Structure formats: C-alpha cells, structure tokens
Write a protein that binds this ligand. Sequence first.
Ligand code: FAD
Ligand code: HEM
Ligand code: FMN
Length: 814
Amino acid sequence: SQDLSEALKEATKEVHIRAENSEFMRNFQKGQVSREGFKLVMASLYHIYTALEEEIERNKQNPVYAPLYFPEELHRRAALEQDMAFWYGPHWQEAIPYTPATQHYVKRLHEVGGTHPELLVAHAYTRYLGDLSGGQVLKKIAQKAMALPSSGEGLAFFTFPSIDNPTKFKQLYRARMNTLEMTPEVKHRVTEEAKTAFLLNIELFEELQALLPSSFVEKMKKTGRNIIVFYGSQTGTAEEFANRLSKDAHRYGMRGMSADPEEYDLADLSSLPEIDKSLVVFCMATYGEGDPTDNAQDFYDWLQETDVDLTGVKFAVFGLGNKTYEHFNAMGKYVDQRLEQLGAQRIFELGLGDDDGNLEEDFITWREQFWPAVCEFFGVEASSIRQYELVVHEDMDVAKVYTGEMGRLKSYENQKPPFDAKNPFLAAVTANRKLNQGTERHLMHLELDISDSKIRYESGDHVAVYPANDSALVNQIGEILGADLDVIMSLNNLDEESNKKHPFPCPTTYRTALTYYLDITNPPRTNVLYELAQYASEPSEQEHLHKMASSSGEGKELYLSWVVEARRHILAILQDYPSLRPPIDHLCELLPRLQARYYSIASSSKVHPNSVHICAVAVEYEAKSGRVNKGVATSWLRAKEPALVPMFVRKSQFRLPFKSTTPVIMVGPGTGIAPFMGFIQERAWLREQGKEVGETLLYYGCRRSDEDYLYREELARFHKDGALTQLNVAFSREQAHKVYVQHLLKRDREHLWKLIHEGGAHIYVCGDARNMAKDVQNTFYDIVAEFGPMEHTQAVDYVKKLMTKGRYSLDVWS
Ligand SMILES: Cc1cc2nc3c(=O)[nH]c(=O)nc-3n(C[C@H](O)[C@H](O)[C@H](O)COP(=O)(O)OP(=O)(O)OC[C@H]3O[C@@H](n4cnc5c(N)ncnc54)[C@H](O)[C@@H]3O)c2cc1C
Ligand code: HEM
Ligand SMILES: Cc1cc2nc3c(=O)[nH]c(=O)nc-3n(C[C@H](O)[C@H](O)[C@H](O)COP(=O)(O)O)c2cc1C
C-alpha cells in the first residue's frame, strides 16, 4: 500500500510463509526442536541481534531511524547473553559457533547500518515484530519440549518485561514506522530489503537444519482412587492444571489422578458410577477454529455420534482459551454442554480461562472455589488439611521482621534503584487538592515527588500504588476475633518442593499483614466461607456457610445476594455471624493478597520530570448491607497530606505522535481526562520550545459545569494560550436530554474527517465510562462512512486499519 506498515506486510507475504514452513521452524511448531538445534539458533541470534543493535545504537538519532529507537522495550542482546551463559556455560564467549549464514546476516546488517541507514528499519521490522507475534507461543513450546525451569532461564530472549501488551506495542511501532518520511523509491527499496532480511532468516534456518542430520475405571478400583482429571493440552498448560488438581485430591481427604485421555476409551465413563463418590474433571484447551487438541481428538469425535448412557456420573470442566479468537473456549464449552446431555450432572460451573489476560489467576480462582463445591456436593465434610504452618516468634529482634515492605527485608528504608513492582519507590506526596467543585463525589489531584529515584516515564504511562487498609478495620477485626495483632509470627508452607514458602513477607505481625499484605475489603470467596464453616458455633450460621459453598442450588442465591451483591467484607461477615470465632493465622492464610492499584499519569515528564501527577475519584458508597464501604487505594491516598506512597511506573502504549505537526483528537469523559492533561502539557511545551504543533482537540465530559468540571481553570488557560485548540465539553446533566462526548464528535464530523484523512491525526479514547468506547467507535464509523464515501463495512475496516497503524488508541479500565 502507501503507508509503510501495510506495504511491508504486503511485500513480505510470501517470504513469511516460506520462513514459517522451513523444516526447522515446522519442527519447532510441532514441539520437535531438540537441545542442539536450539543452542545453534540461539547463538546465531546472539550474533545477529548484537550486530542489529550495534547499528541501531549507531543510528539512534539519524532521522531515518530515530522514531524506532526502543531500547528499554525491544533490545535482546542482554537476554541473549543470559541465554548464552545458560546454554553454553560460563565461558560461552569462546564456545559459541559462528556459522557462515550467521556471518552473512551480520555482514548485511553492518552494510545497512554503515552506508544505508534508511534501510535499517526493514531489518528491525523483520526481527522485533516477529518476536512479538509467534514468540510467546514458541517460548511455551520451548519450555515443554526441552524441560527448562519455569523460572524462565534459558528463554530470556522470549521475555519482554517492559511490554505488557505486545499487540498495542506493535500498533505503536507501525505508527512510528509510518512517520518515516521517504520518497516512493526509498519505500520500495525498504520493502525489498525486508524481503532480503526474511530470505537471510530462511537460509539461516536451512543451514541450521543442514547441521543436524486398560479401562481407567478398574484401574482406579485397583489403585483405590475416586477422582480422575483428563487434560486436553498441546503446550502443557492444561496438563499442569490437571496435575495440580489431582494433587490437591490427596491433600483434601480424597484421592485423584491426572491421566491422558488419548489412550483411554471414554466409554468407561458409564462404568465410573461404580466407584464410591466418583467425579471426573476435564481441563480442555482449544486450538484452531474451535478444534480440540490432538491428544483429545479421539475424545472429541467420540462425543459426536454416541449415545452411551452416563447417568449418575459426576463431572466438572475447566476450559483454556483466548478471548481474541472468535471461538472462545469452544472445546471446553462443548465438553461441558455435552457431558450433561448424556446424563451426567455438573458439580461446578464451567470455567472460561482467558489467555489474553491472566490465565493463571483465572485457574487459581476456579480451583479455589471448585474444591469447596465438591466437598459440599458429595457431603464429605471432613475439613481439609491445612497448607501453612504457624510458628510464633515470641522473642525476636525487630530489624529481622517485615514491617510492611514488599520486596527484600528493610527495602522500604534502604531504597536503591531500580524501582519496580517488587521494589516500589516511596514517593513523597507534595500536593493533594480537590478538583471537584460540588459535593456529589470527591475527586482529587495528587502529586508524588520522584526526584532522585531515577524513575523515567512518558505521558500515557501508568503508575501503580501499593495502599494500606484502614487501621480501624484491622483493629476491629482483631477485637471481634479476640487475638493479639502485635504477635510476631510466620506461616511456612509445608509443601516442601513449592518455592512459595509464605503467603506474604514473613516474619511479620498480624497487624502488619492485615494492613499491608491482605485485602479484608472485597467480598470473600467461597473457599474462605467453607473453611470458616468449621468455626461457627450455631448450626444455623454453620449451615449457611456450608450452603454458600455450593455453586448449584439456593446456596449460590444465598452467596451472591448476601455476600457479593450486598458487598459484605470479612469484618461484616464476622459481625453478622457472631458464631464465627476462627483463629487469625488461618484467616491470614485464607484471605487473598492486597493488590496494587493503577492510575493514568496526569503529567508530562518533559515539564514535570521529578513528579508524577494522579487524578483520581474517591470510592465511597453505601452498601446494600447497611455499612458504608470505602475504596482502599482512594481512601489511603485521600488521607495523605503534605507522607510516603509506595509506587512504581508501568509502561503503556498510549503515546503522542512522534511528529509535533500531527494533530490529536483526545476523548475522555470524567477521570479519563487524566492522561490527556499530560498530553496537553507536553503539547504546550512543544509550542514553547519553538516547534510547529498541529491541532489539539479535547472532548471532555462531565455532569454539571459547577460540579465535576475537572481542571476547568488549567484547561481554560491552555485554550486561551493556543496550546489547546478546541475545548469541546459535554455536560450530561444540564437540561432535559443528556449530552455526551459522542454528540460533540457527531457535531464536528466534517473537521474531524479533514483531520483524519488529510492531516493523519491520532485518535485517543480513555476513561472509566461504561459502554463509551463502542459508542465513540460507532460515531467514528459513521463519520468515515459519510464524508469519505464508503459502505459501513468499508468504514469499519478503515477504522480497524487506523487501529492497526497505531492511530486509534484505547486506555479503558473499571
Ligand atoms: C490502567 C488503569 C488505569 C487507571 N487510571 C485511573 C485514573 O486515572 N483515575 C481513577 O480514579 N481510577 C483509575 N483506575 C482505576 C483504579 O485502579 C481503581 O480501580 C479505582 O481508583 C478504585 O480503587 P480503590 O482501591 O480505591 O477501590 P477498591 O478497594 O479496589 O474497591 C472497588 C470496588 O468497589 C465496588 N463499588 C464501587 N462503587 C460501588 C457502588 N456504588 N456500589 C457498590 N459497589 C461499588 C466495585 O465492585 C469496585 O470494584 C485505573 C485502572 C487501571 C487498570
Ligand atoms: C514459527 C513460525 C512463525 C509463525 C507461526 C508466525 C506467525 C505470525 C503471525 C500469526 C503474525 C501476525 C501477528 C499480527 O499480525 O499481529 C506474524 C507477524 C509477523 N511475523 Fe511471524 N511467524 C513466524 C515466524 C516468523 C519469522 C521467522 C519472521 C522473520 C524473521 C517473522 C516475522 C513476522 C513479522 C515481520 C510480522 C509482522 C507482519 C506485520 O504485521 O506487518 N515471523 N507472524
Ligand atoms: C494455533 C492456536 C489456536 C488457538 N485457538 C484458540 C481458539 O480458537 N479459541 C480459544 O479460546 N483459544 C485458542 N487458543 C488459545 C489456547 O487455547 C491457549 O493458549 C491455551 O492456554 C492452550 O493450552 P495448552 O498450553 O495446554 O495447549 C489457540 C492457541 C493457539 C496456539
């Protein structure tokens, strides 16, 4: 096409297929990689990326490459050196080979970087964009086929810790590519050079392949088991889940096994009710276009044309899938919906594990609420074996006890860079004023000083904050539970080969754990109610706690209405159920960890390099349980008056256009104005530096002009200085009919289309507002369909392409 990204994708169409159909890459896809060939490719890649990043550093400020300089996010030389130390020993510097094809690739890289830097992009595209696509699956295939540690050693090349969303980053990178100004002949040369890079990788792969030359029912009867967990896996995740599930059985009073469904005629599911309290679990991954894993093909086909009566069979299904595919969890959903059709009854609800988000967290939640449901369905209420052992340290020095820090001991006092999720920096609160003018809600503007923390950030990045629970809650819990909160203790995992030795930093006090390490605020899960049922004296409340552990039946109605919908925290449950008198160590073992909370940075590092601004609305509501609930992070921050806040910075892909002349169309109702402030600041700064700045359009939305008009004075000043071109504010509560930002976009349709089509503008959408992103999206669909004559399909394809080129960025949350 005309934009460089689309031209590069279209030009390299055939060579990408040829590269991924090379014998080595095909064997890699099928899990047949072997250790020697992997060492070969990794050493070759070490040489290749060394040369590539050498030339990148050489031309990092040449205008023909400058917009593509992403060392913190993309560079691989360090991870490749780690992997060389792993795969070739401590003296890898002289032990790694240097094959002729690798030298050919390195020579081409050096020629480009030395005499034709305008082509260097074509090589980066060929490598980095490829690493951010298939790589994530290849790492898994590497982990299982070669049995590497789960800690990631040897596969550091496949890990990008500074890219939390490779799709959005690829969009940003395509955007940075299209900014490169070049003549059409140069564009054609660049596409041909991308073809050349693909061919170099292809012949490298070819050369490296030239250097290589009994029924389970009676089985469970003779082994004495009542649980079996079939896993449908291809890269080992469902296998791991099924193995952990069967492992919990022995540690729950029951007895289970994880088996491969391939070499078993599942017609033995009719023979399964002949085992006392038998239940079968299926951990099913789905591949292709809703196709089963190969190891489960015989299973899947069997459920096609069959009529085996499965009456009295107990089953449960957990699916492994990805929401980006349009056949989400087809295999798990099919197994679940089909086992009940043959007569079996569901014990626990079908789990839908998403791989786009945190699949591990979804599975942990599913298992945590699954085991109590089984124990309540079968009636084997024997109360399960614990997992953490209490050890009281009655005499111990204080310099050895965790006092609330997150990483190493005394890491909050001995603060040394780098600062990240495991070592947050304690920033001093310099400002904490009120932006809201009325009294509906409290909306605040905080400022955190990060002077000598060596922390970098850009407009659009996020800042995460570790809060602390309200001390009154902790004291009330310690009172009503009748225990001493200042008891220094520890909880040790007696699962000796599980390196998760503690539920939180230990040794520490119960007060510190309740304040900094635990949640004690969100509605409790099923597992904690089940494990607390054994501590209720009255049989009414004990039976309530037991019934709430059942996913099926009027227990779920009790659990959802009285706990979730009513928003009862742990203290409210201990209050309304006075029979509950459990110990405090078991409670600290059962409660989930306190999560950090993210906020869109509301400042530009080019004008506020030593400060991070936050714009947040305080959470405070009247729960349906009578009590008034407060948000942890927002209340904790509201109390901060100029006072340290443990925070760190997470990189996002929300970025202003590289060219200052490019216009921006920002849309952010309410708190979604947070990052745009920074944008505007930086934009204003670029005008003050004497640079030519394009149009800057803001579409903000609030209720009343005198209630929650955030940054009214600052935005007005920005507008009158010329920095903010248009201030289009939609007030949703000022007449009979409500007005949202969608209507203001619909109004300026013509100018917006001239900005998008002729000016090549960037569109931004941000905020909490529910169902707002799709409304803005449909509005842009209609604008593009109207002015630039198009069918609706052509317009939605135009907008999706803009999203691909990194011109339509979203940063929504909840
Ligand atoms: C990338 C990202 C960026 C973000 N940027 C911002 C930002 O710029 N500004 C900002 O303010 N927030 C932002 N957030 C959201 C923020 O992280 C928190 O979700 C929010 O600030 C509240 O945190 P909290 O700890 O105070 O409340 P929590 O302790 O976490 O409790 C919140 C829960 O309370 C419940 N709840 C809330 N209101 C009610 C109600 N009337 N009735 C019943 N239940 C209710 C809800 O179930 C809600 O989930 C962002 C989130 C992400 C992921
Ligand atoms: C194991 C074999 C491979 C498979 C299955 C594979 C698969 C894919 C897929 C599905 C995409 C599209 C992702 C997206 O559009 O966001 C992609 C993109 C890409 N792949 Fe790979 N790939 C493989 C190997 C390679 C190799 C060897 C290279 C070159 C060294 C490469 C370079 C790229 C590039 C440049 C893109 C980006 C295309 C674009 O969007 O412009 N891939 N790959
Ligand atoms: C080629 C391929 C196709 C996939 N197709 C789907 C799909 O159609 N639907 C879905 O929900 N997930 C799909 N996934 C996501 C997988 O189900 C997910 O990665 C799962 O965790 C794999 O589990 P495993 O490691 O045990 O094989 C697909 C993954 C790959 C690699």
